[PDB]
Amino acid sequence: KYGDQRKFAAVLVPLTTLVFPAVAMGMFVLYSFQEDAFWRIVPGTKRARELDEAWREHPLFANSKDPLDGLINPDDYEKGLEEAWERAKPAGSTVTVKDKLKQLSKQNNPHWESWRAMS
Amino acid sequence: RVPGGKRTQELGLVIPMADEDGLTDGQVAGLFVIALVVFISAMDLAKTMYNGINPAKFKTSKGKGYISPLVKRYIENGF
Amino acid sequence: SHAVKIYDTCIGCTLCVRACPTDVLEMVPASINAAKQVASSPRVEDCVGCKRCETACPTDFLSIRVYLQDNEETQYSLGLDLVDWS
Amino acid sequence: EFAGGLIGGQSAFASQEYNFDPLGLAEKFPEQLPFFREAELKHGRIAMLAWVGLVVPEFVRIPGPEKCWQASAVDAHSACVXXXXXXXXXXXXXXXXXXXXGALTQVFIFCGTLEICGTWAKMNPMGLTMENAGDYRLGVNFLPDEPEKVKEMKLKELKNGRLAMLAFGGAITQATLTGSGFPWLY
Amino acid sequence: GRCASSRYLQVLGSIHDIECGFGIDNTLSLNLQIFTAHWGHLTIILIWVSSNLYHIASNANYSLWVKNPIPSMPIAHNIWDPHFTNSTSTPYSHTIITTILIAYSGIYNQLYTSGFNTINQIYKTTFTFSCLAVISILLAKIHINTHSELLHKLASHTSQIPSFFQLLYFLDVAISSVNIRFNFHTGILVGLFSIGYTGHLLDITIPASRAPLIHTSPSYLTFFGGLKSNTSSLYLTDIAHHHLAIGIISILTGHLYSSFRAALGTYIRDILYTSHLTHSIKSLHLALSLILASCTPLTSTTAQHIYSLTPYFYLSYDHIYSTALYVHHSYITSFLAIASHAHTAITLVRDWVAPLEQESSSKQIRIHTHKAAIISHLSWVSLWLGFHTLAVYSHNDTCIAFNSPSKQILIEASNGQLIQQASGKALYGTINSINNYNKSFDSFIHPISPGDLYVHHAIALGLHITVLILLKGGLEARGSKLMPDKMEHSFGFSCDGPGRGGTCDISAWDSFYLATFWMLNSNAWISFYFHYKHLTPRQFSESSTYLESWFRDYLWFNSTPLIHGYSTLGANDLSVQSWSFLLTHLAWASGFMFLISWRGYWQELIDIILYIHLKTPILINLWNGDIYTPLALSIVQARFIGLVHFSTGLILTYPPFIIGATS
Amino acid sequence: XXXXXXXXXXXXXXXXXXXXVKMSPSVPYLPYPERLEGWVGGEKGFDPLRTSDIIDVYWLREAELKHGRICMLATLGWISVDAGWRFEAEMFQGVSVINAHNKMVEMGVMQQMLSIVGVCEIFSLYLIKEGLLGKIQRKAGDYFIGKNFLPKEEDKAKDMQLKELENGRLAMLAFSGICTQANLFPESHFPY
Numbered sequence A: 001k002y003g004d005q006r007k008f009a010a011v012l013v014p015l016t017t018l019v020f021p022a023v024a025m026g027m028f029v030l031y032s033f034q035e036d037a038f039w040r041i042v043p044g045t046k047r048a049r050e051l052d053e054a055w056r057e058h059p060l061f062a063n064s065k066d067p068l069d070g071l072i073n074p075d076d077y078e079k080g081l082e083e084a085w086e087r088a089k090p091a092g093s094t095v096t097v098k099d100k101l102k103q104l105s106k107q108n109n110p111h112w113e114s115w116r117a118m119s
Numbered sequence B: 001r002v003p004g005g006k007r008t009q010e011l012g013l014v015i016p017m018a019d020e021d022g023l024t025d026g027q028v029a030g031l032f033v034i035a036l037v038v039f040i041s042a043m044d045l046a047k048t049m050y051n052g053i054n055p056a057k058f059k060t061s062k063g064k065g066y067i068s069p070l071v072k073r074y075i076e077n078g079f
Numbered sequence C: 001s002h003a004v005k006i007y008d009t010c011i012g013c014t015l016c017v018r019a020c021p022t023d024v025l026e027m028v029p030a031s032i033n034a035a036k037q038v039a040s041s042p043r044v045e046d047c048v049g050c051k052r053c054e055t056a057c058p059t060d061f062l063s064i065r066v067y068l069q070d071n072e073e074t075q076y077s078l079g080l081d082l083v084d085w086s
Numbered sequence D: 001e002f003a004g005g006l007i008g009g010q011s012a013f014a015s016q017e018y019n020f021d022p023l024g025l026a027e028k029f030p031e032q033l034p035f036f037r038e039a040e041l042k043h044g045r046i047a048m049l050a051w052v053g054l055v056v057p058e059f060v061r062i063p064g065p066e067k068c069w070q071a072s073a074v075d076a077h078s079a080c081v082x083x084x085x086x087x088x089x090x091x092x093x094x095x096x097x098x099x100x101x102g103a104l105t106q107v108f109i110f111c112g113t114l115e116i117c118g119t120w121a122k123m124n125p126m127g128l129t130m131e132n133a134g135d136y137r138l139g140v141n142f143l144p145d146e147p148e149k150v151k152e153m154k155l156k157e158l159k160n161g162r163l164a165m166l167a168f169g170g171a172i173t174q175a176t177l178t179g180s181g182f183p184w185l186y
Numbered sequence E: 001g002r003c004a005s006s007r008y009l010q011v012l013g014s015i016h017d018i019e020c021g022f023g024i025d026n027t028l029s030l031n032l033q034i035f036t037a038h039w040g041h042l043t044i045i046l047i048w049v050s051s052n053l054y055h056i057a058s059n060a061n062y063s064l065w066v067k068n069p070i071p072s073m074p075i076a077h078n079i080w081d082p083h084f085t086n087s088t089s090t091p092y093s094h095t096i097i098t099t100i101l102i103a104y105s106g107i108y109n110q111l112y113t114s115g116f117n118t119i120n121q122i123y124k125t126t127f128t129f130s131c132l133a134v135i136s137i138l139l140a141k142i143h144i145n146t147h148s149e150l151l152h153k154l155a156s157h158t159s160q161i162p163s164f165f166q167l168l169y170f171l172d173v174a175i176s177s178v179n180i181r182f183n184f185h186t187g188i189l190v191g192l193f194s195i196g197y198t199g200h201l202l203d204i205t206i207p208a209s210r211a212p213l214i215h216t217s218p219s220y221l222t223f224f225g226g227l228k229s230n231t232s233s234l235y236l237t238d239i240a241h242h243h244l245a246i247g248i249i250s251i252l253t254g255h256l257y258s259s260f261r262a263a264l265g266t267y268i269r270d271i272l273y274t275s276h277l278t279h280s281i282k283s284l285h286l287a288l289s290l291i292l293a294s295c296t297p298l299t300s301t302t303a304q305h306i307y308s309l310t311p312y313f314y315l316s317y318d319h320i321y322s323t324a325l326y327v328h329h330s331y332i333t334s335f336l337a338i339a340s341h342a343h344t345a346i347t348l349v350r351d352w353v354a355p356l357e358q359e360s361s362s363k364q365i366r367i368h369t370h371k372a373a374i375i376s377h378l379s380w381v382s383l384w385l386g387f388h389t390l391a392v393y394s395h396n397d398t399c400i401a402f403n404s405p406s407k408q409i410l411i412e413a414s415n416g417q418l419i420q421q422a423s424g425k426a427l428y429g430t431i432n433s434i435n436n437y438n439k440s441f442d443s444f445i446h447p448i449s450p451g452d453l454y455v456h457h458a459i460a461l462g463l464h465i466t467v468l469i470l471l472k473g474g475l476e477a478r479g480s481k482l483m484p485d486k487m488e489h490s491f492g493f494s495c496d497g498p499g500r501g502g503t504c505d506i507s508a509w510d511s512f513y514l515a516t517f518w519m520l521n522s523n524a525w526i527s528f529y530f531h532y533k534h535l536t537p538r539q540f541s542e543s544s545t546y547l548e549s550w551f552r553d554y555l556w557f558n559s560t561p562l563i564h565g566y567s568t569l570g571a572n573d574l575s576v577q578s579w580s581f582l583l584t585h586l587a588w589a590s591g592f593m594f595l596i597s598w599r600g601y602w603q604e605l606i607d608i609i610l611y612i613h614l615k616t617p618i619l620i621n622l623w624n625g626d627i628y629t630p631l632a633l634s635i636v637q638a639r640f641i642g643l644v645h646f647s648t649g650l651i652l653t654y655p656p657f658i659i660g661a662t663s
Numbered sequence F: 001x002x003x004x005x006x007x008x009x010x011x012x013x014x015x016x017x018x019x020x021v022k023m024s025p026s027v028p029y030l031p032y033p034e035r036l037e038g039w040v041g042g043e044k045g046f047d048p049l050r051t052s053d054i055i056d057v058y059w060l061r062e063a064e065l066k067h068g069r070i071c072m073l074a075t076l077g078w079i080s081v082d083a084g085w086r087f088e089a090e091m092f093q094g095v096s097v098i099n100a101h102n103k104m105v106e107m108g109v110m111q112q113m114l115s116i117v118g119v120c121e122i123f124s125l126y127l128i129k130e131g132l133l134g135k136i137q138r139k140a141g142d143y144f145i146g147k148n149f150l151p152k153e154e155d156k157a158k159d160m161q162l163k164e165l166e167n168g169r170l171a172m173l174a175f176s177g178i179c180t181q182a183n184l185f186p187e188s189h190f191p192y
C-alpha cells in the first residue's frame, strides 16, 4: 500500500522532534554549568588559558603577540634611533632614547584583561 | 483530498498517488546505515572543531610531522 | 568591567568627576593644562557605563572616553541589586 | 652568450657561428629556452621517425584491419582513424567497430602516457635546465666519454632533426600534391 | 563572579565569529577553522540534496507525475502529525490513504529534465549524495590532520638562521593562496564542471527525452533559441551547447594566474597594482563581501531567467512553481546583496589599514575622501525617486477616486520600450534567418506600460535607499562627525550615550539593521510586481497606476481563498497556509516590541519579577539568582531579535499568499 | 645530494651538481623521490606523475596493497570459475564467469557479500585514519592478520613485503588482461 512508510514515521517523528530535542536541551543546560562552557567566547575560562599557553609554547608563535615583533636586529635599530636622536636632541635635553622608549612602553591600565585571574 | 484555490478546482488539477510503496524497508535501512555513518563522522568533526588545533602536540605526540613535497613548493612559490 | 580612558586634551573641568554616579573618576595633578590637573579613572571596575562623564566633557571631542565591553560585564558594571555575584 | 650556450648554433664553415635567430627569440625568451630546445629535439625526433615511416610503407604494409593498412601515405591518417564521433572520442555505444571508431587511438594513448611520464614528469615534479634539455638518459651508455665527442654527437642529432623536419614537410606536401612513390614528384 | 542570563544571547550573537574566538591566536587557526566549517557546510548541503531526493523517492509520486506532468501535482512528503483528526479524513489525503503535501520547490521538473525516469535512479542518487557527505566530512578530518602534521613538522623545522620565523606566515599558504585558487576555481570548478554537465546532457538528458538517435553525434549541439514547443522549455541541445561554450571559455580563462609554477601566468597582486584597485586581498571579510556581491547578480538572474526562459520540462505549466521559485531566489539574492555591504563595513572596521591622513592611494582612501559627496548625492536621488513616485501615485489615486480615470499622469515607459524594441528586432532578425523558424521566447520581453514604469521607479527607489543606508554605514563605520572614534569600538555596539544630542543606532551594525528593513521592503515591492503581473497581466496593465488598485485588486481580492482555508464550514488543503499566515503575522507583530520598547523598561520589569521569585516561599530556598541572573536583553541583542522577528514575519507571510493565490 | 639544492632562501639558491643528484633507478632522468625512502618498494624509486609529492605515502601504500590483494584474489576467482569450479551447493550454475555477477546479484547472494565486504571496509576506514593519525600502532595495509608467518630477520621481512607487492602488481595487470580478454573474446579461460 502507499502507506507502510508510516511505520518509520511513528518512531522517527516522535523521536527526533521530542526525545532528541528534550535531551539536547537538558544536555545544553547541563553544559552551561561546566567550567569549560562557551570557552571560546566567554572570557576567563581555563581552556582559553591553556590554549593560549600552548600556542606560546610553539617555537614559531613564541613572540607572536608582541606588536613590535619583526626587528631582525633590534640592537641596530636602537643604535640608529639613538644616533638620529642625538643630532636632533634639543639643546641641553636630558632625555635618552632608551629610557624614553622604556617609559613610552609602560602605561598604566590596571583594568585591562583583568579577567585573567579566575580560571 | 479537498482542494483549495480557484485554479485547482477550475482546471481539475489532481495529485496522483502511487498505489505501491515507493521504497522497500530494506532500501530505507540501507540509507539509514550511511546516514548513521554521516552522523558519527559529523559528531567527530564537531568535537574537533570545538576543541580546535592543539599546537602542543609536538611535545607529546609521536612522529615528527610532515609537509608534503607540493606544500613546500606552494610555500616557496609565493603567497 | 568597561574601559574608561582619559586623554591629554583634558583641561581639568572636574565636571566628569562630578557627573560620575559611582565614584570612578578622580582629579590628579598634572602640568599639561592651565588648570594643572587632569582626570583619572582608577576605579573603572565600578563603572556602570552611564556615559554621564562623556556628556559633561566640554572638549571638542571627549577627553574622557568610555568603551563598552558587554562580554566583560561584572556585577558592579551591571548594577545588580537583587543578585550577588560574590 | 648566444641562446644560453646551446648546441646547434655553430656554423659549419668553422671559425664562424651561424647563431641563426633572425627573429631574436633566444634573447626575447631566455626563460623558455630549455623548453624551446625540448620542443626542437622532440620535433626533430618525431620528424625523423615520420620520414622513415613515410618512405617505408611504399614497400611493406603490415597486414591488419583492412579499413586501414591500405592506400597512399596521404590517405593513411584519416583512413587509419576512421569517422570518429567528434575527435579521438571512442564510441562506447558500439565498441568493436561496426560503423565508427579509431585505429591509431592506441598510438595516441601510448604517446600520451609516454609524454606525461616523460616531458611532464621532467618539468612538473621535483627540473629541466639548459644542458639537460633533450636528455632523457636514454642510451647514454652508448654516448662516448669525451667532452667534444658528446657535443658533436648532440650537434649531429640536432641537425639531422632539423633536416628531417624540413624533409617531412616537403615530402608530405609533395605526396598530397602528386601522390606517386618515394621521389614524391609530378 | 559569574555570568547572567545575557550570556546565551552574547555567545550566540558571535557563535560563528571565528575572528572573535578566544583560543584563536593566528591566521593559521582562523583559516583552518573556516576551511573545516566549509567542509561541514558542504556536507550539510549534500545531506539536504539527498533528503529531497529520498523523499521524492519514498514519500512521493515521481513515477506517476512524470507520465502526465501538466495536470498532475507532485508530492513533497507525507504528513505524520498526531494532532490531526484520528477520525474522518484530512483535506490533505484521499480518504483512507495517507496524508501528503504538494511540492512547490521545483525538483520534479529538475529531475525530469536531467533525465530521471525511475524511482530506483533517485534512490541510487540519494545513496551517492550521502556517500559524498561522508567524503566531505572525511576530507575535513584529513585537512585538519594535515595542517596539524605541518605544525608538528615544526618540531623538526629550523632555518639555522634567525629568518626561520618567516615560516609563521606561510603555514596557511594552502588556504590563503589566491592565484592557485583563482586559476583552479575558474578553470576546473566552472569550465570543466560545465563541460562535464554537457557530457551528462549528451549522454543521458537528450537520449532520455526523444526517440533513439545516433551515438550522441555533434548534431546534439544546436543553436535554435528558446521554448521548445511541446515541453515549453529550452532545447536540451541548446543547453548542452551553452554549457559547452561556457566551459571552453572558462577553461581558457583559468590559465591566467600563476598557480603551480612561477614561470607561467601573471600574479593577481601585479594585476591589481597597475589598475584602480590594489586592495588588501588578505582580508577574509573583503573576499567574502565581494563574492557575496557576486552570488547576488547570479541569484537575481537565476530568479529572472528561470521564469523568463523556463529551462525545465513543463515548468511554465505549473502556476505555483514559477512564482515560488522567482520569489525564493529574489529573497536569496537580496540577502546576499545586503550581506556584501555588511561584510564591506566589517572589512573597513576590522581588516583595513589606511594611510596617515592624505595619501590618496588606496581605493577606499579615495572613496573616503569624498564620502560626503557620495552620501549626499545618494540621498538626493533617493529623495527624488520617492517624491516623484509617491506624488504621481497619489495623483492617480486621487483622480481615480474622483471618478476621473482620464486625469491620471501616465508617463509611457518609452526607454524600456525602446530597449525592448531593439531586442525584439534583433531576435526577429535571428528568427527570420532560420529554416526552422517560428520560435518562442516566453516572457523575455513583456508588455511594458505606465504601471511598469511607476513600479520600476519604486524598485529603483528601494535599491537606492538600501544602498544609501549600507554605504553610509560602511563609509562612516570608521568614524563620522558625530562619533569620530567609531573604529576603536566593535562593529556592533549599543550607542554612545544620551549626551552629545543622543546617539541611538550609531554603530555600523545599526546601519545594517536599518538597511535590512529597506531590503525587505524593496524585495516585497519586486515580488508584488512580479506576482501581480503573473496573476492578471491585463488588469495590471490597465489598473496598476494608482496604489488603491494594488491594495484592492491584488491584496484584498487575491486573499479570498487563503482566509477561507479553515473556517466554520470545513477545511481545504490550504489550512496550513492560513494557519502559517496568521502565525507569521503574530511573529511579525511580536518583533515590534523588541524594536519599539527598549531595554530599561524591561530591565525594571525583570527586576520586579526577580523580586517576586526571591520572595516566593519555596523558590528562595532553592534559587537565589546568583548563578544565571535574569537580565533584560542588551540593546544590540534586542535590535537583532526584533529584526529577526520582523524579517521572519515579513518573509514567511508571503508564501501562504502565493500558494493561496496561484494554486 | 638528497636535497633539491643548497641555500638559505629560494632566490639565491644553489642547485645541486647534476652528476651529484641521487636520481631514480627506474626513471633514470628523474631525481629520486625522497618521500618514498623507508617504505618497502623504495629501491626502484618509481614515481613519475608525482603522486607521492602530494599525497602521504601511507595512503598510496594502503591503496597499492588493497588493489594488489584484491586483484590476487580476483585473478584466482576468475581463473577457477572459468576453468569450472562452481561451489558445491546448487544455485551456483552460472555457466560463465562474465554473467556470474549479474546472475548472482539476481539470486540474492551478492547483496550478502557486499554487506560483509562493506563492514570490513568500514572497519578498514577506521584503521586507515587512526593508522595515519599516529594514534594506533599500524602500518600501511597491515590489518594485523597473519604476522606469525612473517619472517623475522629484519631483511627477510623486507623481501616478503616486497614479494607481496610484486605479486600484487602482477595480479593488477593480470586481472585487467583477464577481464578485458574475456569480453572481447567470450572464449573464457585462464589460457583464453
Ligand code: CLA
Pocket (backbone or CB within 6 Å): E586, E589, E590, E591, E592, E593, E596, E597
Ligand atoms: C503581537 C505582538 C505582541 C505580543 C504577542 C506581545 C506580548 C506581550 N507583551 Mg507586548 N508589545 C508589542 C507587541 C506584542 N507584545 C508591541 C508592538 C509593543 C509596543 C512597544 C509592546 C509593548 C509592550 C509593553 C510595554 C508591555 C508588553 C507586555 C507584553 C506581555 C504581556 C502579555 C502576556 O504575558 O501574554 C503572554 C504572551 C503571549 C504572546 C500570549 C500568547 C502566548 C502563547 C499563544 C501561548 C504559549 C505558546 C506555547 C507555549 C508554544 C510554546 C513555544 C514553542 C516553541 C513550543 C506579553 C509577553 C507587558 C509585559 O511583559 O508585562 C507582563 C508590558 O509591560 N508589551
Ligand code: CLA
Pocket (backbone or CB within 6 Å): D046, D047, D049, D050, D052, D053, D054, D056, D057, D060, D061, D062, D063, D068, D069, D070, D071, D072, D073, D076, D077, D080, D104
Ligand atoms: C612518427 C612516426 C610514425 C608515425 C606517426 C606512423 C604512423 C603510421 N604508420 Mg608507420 N612507420 C614508422 C613511423 C611512423 N608511422 C617507421 C619509422 C616505420 C619503419 C619501421 C614505419 C613503418 C610502417 C609500416 C610498414 C606501416 C606503417 C603504417 C602506419 C599507419 C598505421 C599505424 C601503424 O600500425 O604503424 C605501424 C608502424 C610501425 C610498426 C613502426 C613503428 C616504429 C616507431 C615509430 C618507433 C617507436 C617509437 C618509440 C615511441 C620510441 C622508443 C623506441 C625507440 C628506441 C626506437 C600510421 C599512419 C601502416 C599503414 O597503413 O601505412 C600506410 C603500415 O603498413 N608504418
Ligand code: CLA
Pocket (backbone or CB within 6 Å): E376, E377, E379, E380, E383
Ligand atoms: C535655501 C534653501 C535651500 C537650498 C538652496 C537647498 C539646496 C540643496 N539641497 Mg536642501 N534643504 C533645505 C533648503 C535648501 N536646500 C531645507 C530647508 C531642508 C530641510 C527639509 C533641506 C533638505 C535637504 C536634503 C535632505 C537634501 C537636500 C539636498 C540639496 C541639494 C540638491 C538639491 C535638492 O535636493 O533640493 C531638494 C530640496 C529639498 C527636498 C528640501 C526642501 C526644499 C526647501 C523646503 C526649500 C526652502 C527654501 C527657503 C524657504 C527659501 C526662503 C527664502 C526667503 C527666506 C528669502 C542642494 C544643494 C540634497 C543633497 O545634499 O544632494 C546634493 C539632499 O539629499 N536638501
Ligand code: CLA
Pocket (backbone or CB within 6 Å): D109, D110, D113, F026, F036, F039, F040, F041, F042, F043, F044, F045, F046, F047, F050, F051, F052, F053, F057, F060, F061, F062, F063, F064, F067, F169, F170, F172, F173
Ligand atoms: C591502483 C594501483 C596502484 C597504487 C595505488 C600504487 C601505489 C604506489 N606504487 Mg605502484 N604499481 C602498480 C599499481 C599501483 N601502485 C602496478 C600495477 C605496478 C606495475 C607496473 C606498479 C609498480 C610500482 C613500482 C615499480 C614502484 C611503485 C611505487 C608505488 C608507490 C609510489 C608511487 C605513487 O605515488 O603512485 C601512487 C599513485 C597511483 C598509482 C595512481 C595512479 C593512477 C593513474 C592516474 C592511472 C594511470 C594508469 C592508467 C590505468 C593507464 C591508462 C590506460 C591507457 C590510457 C594507456 C605507491 C605506494 C614505488 C614504490 O615502491 O615507492 C614506495 C615504486 O618504486 N609501483
Ligand SMILES: CC(=O)O[C@H]1CC(C)(C)C(=C=C/C(C)=C/C=C/C(C)=C/C=C/C=C(C)/C=C/C=C(C)/C=C/[C@@]23O[C@]2(C)C[C@@H](O)CC3(C)C)[C@](C)(O)C1
Pocket (backbone or CB within 6 Å): D048, D049, D051, D052, D138, D139, D140, D142, D160, D161, D163, D164, D166, D167, D168, D170, D171, D174, D182, D183, D184, D185
Ligand atoms: C636502450 C636504447 O634503445 O638506447 C637507444 C638510445 C637512442 C638514442 C634512442 C637510439 C637511437 C637513435 C635512433 C633511434 C636514431 C634514429 C634516427 C633516424 C631514424 C633518423 C632519420 C633521419 C632522416 C632524415 C634526416 C631524412 C632526410 C630526408 C631528406 C633530406 C629528404 C629529402 C627529399 O629530397 C628527397 C630525397 C626526395 C624529394 O622528393 C623531397 C625530399 C623528401 C625533401 C638507439 C640507437 O636506439 C639506442
Ligand SMILES: CC1=C(C#C/C(C)=C/C=C/C(C)=C/C=C/C=C(C)/C=C/C=C(C)/C=C/[C@@]23O[C@]2(C)C[C@@H](O)CC3(C)C)C(C)(C)C[C@H](O)C1
Pocket (backbone or CB within 6 Å): D074, D075, D077, D078, D165, D166, D168, D169, D170, D172, D173, D176
Ligand atoms: C596533409 C595531411 C595531413 C597532414 C599533415 C602534415 C603533417 C603536414 C605537415 C606539413 C609540414 C610539416 C610543413 C612544413 C613546412 C616547412 C617549411 C615551409 C620550412 C621552410 C623553411 C625555410 C623556408 C628555410 C629557409 C632557410 O634555409 C634558408 C633558405 C637559408 C638558411 O640559411 C636559413 C633558413 C632556415 C631561413 C593530415 C592532417 C595529418 C591528414 C590529412 O588527411 C592529410
Ligand code: SF4
Pocket (backbone or CB within 6 Å): C006, C009, C010, C011, C012, C013, C014, C015, C016, C017, C038, C039, C053, C056, C057, C058, C059, C062, C063, C064
Ligand atoms: S570633563 Fe573632560 S575635560 Fe573636564 S576634567 Fe573631565 S575629562 Fe577633563
Ligand code: SF4
Pocket (backbone or CB within 6 Å): C004, C019, C020, C021, C022, C023, C024, C025, C046, C047, C048, C049, C050, C051, C052, C053, C054, C066
Ligand atoms: S560611564 Fe558613568 S560610571 Fe563610568 S566613569 Fe563615566 S560617569 Fe562614571
